[PDB]
């Protein structure tokens, strides 16, 4: 992946962490049944005003070695390609070729 | 659609722009990119120029449009026929 695309993810992870608790607060108000319409309404409007990149759903898992945005495995934090390379060199503990 | 418990969505930037347009008078077309904003009752009689990807399409808001998203009145794809 391009360097800029890798920099966007870093920026998304940082903003998400930086506004995590604020977002959690506002979303609690919005969904709370025993809250005023005005409080819910103000919370809806406030949640918009935060940076979009503070939303965790904006993050795309990328291979930590290449930045590839497809073929990711969460276990390894790598794309299918870099998993296989590491696997065969014996760099992934316990992982071997499976037959059954 | 959006769950009723959360209310109708509207971008704050458009909400304030509508409120200021209503109080001032019969102002110019309100330029917006907020296709996702619900048409509220207080927008009736305003012209909202809604972005369709390349142009701001003027949408004269009527009572029947209330509850719809602005993007519904600004088609994004051009198609006139194949032959």
């Amino acid at each position: 992946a391009k360097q800029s695309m890798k920099a966007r993810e870093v920026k998304r992870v940082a903003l998400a962490d930086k506004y995590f608790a604020k977002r959690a607060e506002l979303k609690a108000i919005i969904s709370d049944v025993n809250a005023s319409d005005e409080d819910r309404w103000n919370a809806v409007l406030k949640l918009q005003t935060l940076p979009r990149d503070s939303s965790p759903s904006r993050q795309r898992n990328r291979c930590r070695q290449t930045g590839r945005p497809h073929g990711f495995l969460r276990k390894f934090g790598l794309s299918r390609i870099k998993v296989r390379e590491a696997a065969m060199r014996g760099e992934i503990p316990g992982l071997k070729k499976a037959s059954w | 659609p959006r769950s009723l418990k959360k209310g109708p969505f509207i971008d704050l930037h458009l909400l304030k722009k509508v409120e200021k347009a209503v109080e001032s008078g019969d102002k110019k077309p309100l330029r917006t990119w907020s296709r996702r904003s619900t048409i509220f009752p207080n927008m009736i009689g305003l012209t909202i120029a809604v972005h369709n990807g390349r142009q701001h399409v003027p949408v004269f808001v009527t009572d029947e449009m209330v509850g719809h998203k602005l993007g519904e009145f600004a088609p994004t794809r051009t198609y006139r026929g194949h032959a």
Binding site: D37 | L4, G7, G67
Partner: peptide, 12 residues
């Protein structure tokens, strides 16, 4: 018509 359902269904 549409203003009525709007004002009813949504609590402001």
């Amino acid at each position: 018509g549409r203003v009525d359902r709007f004002n009813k269904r949504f609590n402001i």
